[PDB]
Amino acid sequence: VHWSAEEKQLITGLWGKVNVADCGAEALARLLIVYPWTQRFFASFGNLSSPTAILGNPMVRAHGKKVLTSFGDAVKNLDNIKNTFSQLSELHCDKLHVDPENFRLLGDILIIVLAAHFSKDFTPECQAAWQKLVRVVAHALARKYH
Amino acid sequence: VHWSAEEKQLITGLWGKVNVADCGAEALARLLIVYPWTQRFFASFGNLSSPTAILGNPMVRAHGKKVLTSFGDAVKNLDNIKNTFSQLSELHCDKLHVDPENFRLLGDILIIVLAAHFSKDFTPECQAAWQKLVRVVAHALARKYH
Amino acid sequence: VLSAADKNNVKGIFTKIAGHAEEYGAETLERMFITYPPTKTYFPHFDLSHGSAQIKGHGKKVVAALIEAANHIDDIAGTLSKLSDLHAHKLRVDPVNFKLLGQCFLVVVAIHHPAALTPEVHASLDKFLCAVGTVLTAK
Amino acid sequence: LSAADKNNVKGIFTKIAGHAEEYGAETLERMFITYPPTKTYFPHFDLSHGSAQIKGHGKKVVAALIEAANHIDDIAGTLSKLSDLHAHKLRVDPVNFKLLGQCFLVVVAIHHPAALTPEVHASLDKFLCAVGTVLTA
Numbered sequence: 001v002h003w004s005a006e007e008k009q010l011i012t013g014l015w016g017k018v019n020v021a022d023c024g025a026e027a028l029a030r031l032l033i034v035y036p037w038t039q040r041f042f043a044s045f046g047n048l049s050s051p052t053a054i055l056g057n058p059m060v061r062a063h064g065k066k067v068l069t070s071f072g073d074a075v076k077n078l079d080n081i082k083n084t085f086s087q088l089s090e091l092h093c094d095k096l097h098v099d100p101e102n103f104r105l106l107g108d109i110l111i112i113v114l115a116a117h118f119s120k121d122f123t124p125e126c127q128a129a130w131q132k133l134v135r136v137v138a139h140a141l142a143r144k145y146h
Numbered sequence: 147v148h149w150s151a152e153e154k155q156l157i158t159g160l161w162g163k164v165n166v167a168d169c170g171a172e173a174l175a176r177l178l179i180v181y182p183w184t185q186r187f188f189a190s191f192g193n194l195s196s197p198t199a200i201l202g203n204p205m206v207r208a209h210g211k212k213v214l215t216s217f218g219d220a221v222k223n224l225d226n227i228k229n230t231f232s233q234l235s236e237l238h239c240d241k242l243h244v245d246p247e248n249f250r251l252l253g254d255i256l257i258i259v260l261a262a263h264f265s266k267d268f269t270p271e272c273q274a275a276w277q278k279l280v281r282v283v284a285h286a287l288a289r290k291y292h
Numbered sequence: 293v294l295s296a297a298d299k300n301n302v303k304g305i306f307t308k309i310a311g312h313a314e315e316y317g318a319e320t321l322e323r324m325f326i327t328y329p330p331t332k333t334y335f336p337h338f339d340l341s342h343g344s345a346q347i348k349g350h351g352k353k354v355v356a357a358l359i360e361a362a363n364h365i366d367d368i369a370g371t372l373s374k375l376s377d378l379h380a381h382k383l384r385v386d387p388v389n390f391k392l393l394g395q396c397f398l399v400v401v402a403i404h405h406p407a408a409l410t411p412e413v414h415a416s417l418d419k420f421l422c423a424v425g426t427v428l429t430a431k
Numbered sequence: 432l433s434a435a436d437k438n439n440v441k442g443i444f445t446k447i448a449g450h451a452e453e454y455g456a457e458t459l460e461r462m463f464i465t466y467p468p469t470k471t472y473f474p475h476f477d478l479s480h481g482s483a484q485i486k487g488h489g490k491k492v493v494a495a496l497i498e499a500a501n502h503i504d505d506i507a508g509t510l511s512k513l514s515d516l517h518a519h520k521l522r523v524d525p526v527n528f529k530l531l532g533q534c535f536l537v538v539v540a541i542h543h544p545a546a547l548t549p550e551v552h553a554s555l556d557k558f559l560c561a562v563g564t565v566l567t568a
């Protein structure tokens with residue numbers, strides 16, 4: 001994948017304004033709420049019995065921050081995403097057996113969370129660049145299946 | 147992907163008995179009949195207006211033989227699938243814009259056609275090896291999207 | 293299968309959508325065409341430059357059909373029955389595209405009504421959009 | 432589901448009805464072998480070849496399908512209890528219903544290939560997608 005000058009500027013520029021802890025918690029909670037079968041991977045986190053319980057669950061919020069933080073490791077060097085995510089690919093494919101369609105669903109949820117956070121600053125062009133980024137990260141995460 | 151000696155044996159052994167022309171024609175016909183939106187990519191083939199017309203369509207039959215023939219080029223060199231299909235990837239991704247979900251659907255259909263053609267000789271272990279093969283070819287066909 | 297809470301959540305947020313059909317529909321299409329460029333292949337007859345009149349007119353019709361499905365949320369297949377024939381039989385829209393449009397619509401709703409698009413409302417709106425997609429692909 | 436579709440599904444299932452345990456057991460064995468991650472939903476099962484739990488469970492899966500066939504006009508109503516089990520209790524990822532349906536169609540093609548015409552295949556795919564949608568609700 002090639003990154004244009006504009007795409008890199010749209011991604012790094014928005015990233016500096018992201019509230020990693022808040023957006024990360026929101027994205028992970030929406031995944032568990034919008035796509036509830038994903039809750040099967042997170043029984044260790046405890047009470048996921050309602051949207052309220054999920055949104056207020058400390059382990060969910062803690063985990064969302066870690067997930068968005070790794071997205072930031074993609075933002076930092078966009079041309080090395082494959083290697084950056086290789087160990088996480090082993091975890092999700094060889095160990096957890098998460099179907100990669102779920103990587104796409106978390107990426108789409110994150111775009112909606114970013115839209116909610118940035119309102120009209122999340123231009124069509126910015127959405128297009130961030131959708132590209134989440135698709136490239138999901139591809140890198142699925143690498144160990146192939 | 148890594149190929150076990152048994153998987154190699156199951157794949158090369160079944161391939162030698164495949165009726166490339168008949169199986170290929172039947173797989174493409176079923177794609178167009180079972181998943182009719184795929185007919186949008188094949189208007190150059192003329193009459194696709196009914197199951198009868200599709201199965202009797204000379205260009206459909208000829209194209210299916212070409213498609214299954216390329217699957218044979220993967221059988222011949224299982225460790226080089228990525229490079230064998232690189233030019234076909236440019237065609238399907240950059241030029242035709244076929245969504246890769248449809249590559250999966252064609253593969254699943256081919257498995258069902260091979261089961262019909264081989265009956266109980268299409269063991270569970272054979273199916274697992276051939277499902278792996280169509281999954282790897284579909285991954286190689288989608289390379290140019292990333 | 294839309295639950296009773298689902299229908300309540302969908303009609304609730306659709307009260308803010310009504311009256312902005314043209315603006316939200318035009319923005320949903322522009323987002324789809326730039327985020328997912330291959331979707332433009334269904335519209336070769338369109339002027340697809342930003343702000344074109346065909347996009348604004350088409351966007352309005354798309355959101356108007358959604359609002360009509362919301363007002364008849366108990367029977368979506370019947371409300372959108374002739375649209376199914378157009379998309380599945382005549383247009384041959386690949387089913388993956390209805391997820392792309394639905395994604396773009398939720399993005400528009402989040403941009404303009406983030407407080408209304410709570411996780412529960414997002415979940416219900418996702419089911420509604422997937423049901424509409426099922427109808428429009430059912431040939 | 433069209434009327435031709437309903438008749439097409441009823442048609443092959445007269446060949447299926449006699450062999451619910453046999454075809455159900457083979458459908459599951461193919462799923463576990465072709466898609467090994469599907470075994471994580473059955474940690475309580477003996478999953479060795481020919482085990483009694485697979486044969487027992489395979490008979491129930493196909494018997495549920497036969498009941499959906501015998502009540503094809505309201506399948507959601509005939510399989511209502513199974514939705515809560517699969518979606519709420521088991522949290523089966525919806526991708527797995529496509530894998531099992533694929534294995535079922537492979538079993539049908541192996542045993543009744545002339546009956547699995549392209550048109551019957553089309554109708555059975557729509558039937559299996561509808562069942563999967565009901566079990567994921």
Ligand code: HEM
Nearest residue numbers: 038041042066067070071096098102103104106107138141
């Ligand atoms: C799509 C992009 C994703 C990224 C970038 C990502 C990233 C991460 C990261 C950074 C961790 C931290 C590992 C650790 O600290 O031990 C993690 C763990 C984990 N992830 Fe993901 N993830 C993604 C998607 C998913 C999805 C879609 C699922 C499930 C449906 C999932 C399930 C898990 C689980 C179960 C863990 C283990 C958590 C624990 O036991 O503490 N991940 N992931």
Ligand code: HEM
Nearest residue numbers: 184187188190212213216217242244248249252283284287
């Ligand atoms: C793994 C799956 C597939 C393989 C291995 C494959 C293979 C091939 C091959 C060998 C050609 C040769 C072109 C020629 O000989 O002229 C071709 C062309 C083509 N393929 Fe595929 N194909 C696959 C899936 C698909 C799917 C799913 C679609 C559409 C839904 C598609 C659409 C086309 C079209 C439209 C052409 C051009 C036909 C023409 O203009 O003559 N392919 N493909």
Ligand code: HEM
Nearest residue numbers: 331334335350353354357358375383385389390393424425
């Ligand atoms: C929620 C999903 C959708 C809704 C509610 C919807 C609604 C509509 C409506 C109301 C029309 C006008 C019908 C008429 O004037 O008789 C239309 C036409 C059309 N739709 Fe959709 N649509 C949806 C999804 C899609 C998608 C995903 C695509 C392609 C990616 C698409 C492509 C088209 C095209 C090409 C036309 C013809 C437009 C024209 O010639 O004016 N639609 N749709």
Ligand code: HEM
Nearest residue numbers: 469472473488491492495496513521523527528531562563
């Ligand atoms: C056509 C699709 C399916 C049908 C008709 C079906 C039908 C059934 C039936 C009849 C039962 C037993 C209900 C009972 O005895 O109370 C059951 C249970 C179960 N299903 Fe499915 N099922 C389907 C798909 C799946 C899939 C895709 C999975 C996972 C890959 C799955 C995993 C299970 C498990 C783990 C049980 C519990 C088994 C036990 O504890 O005895 N099912 N299903």
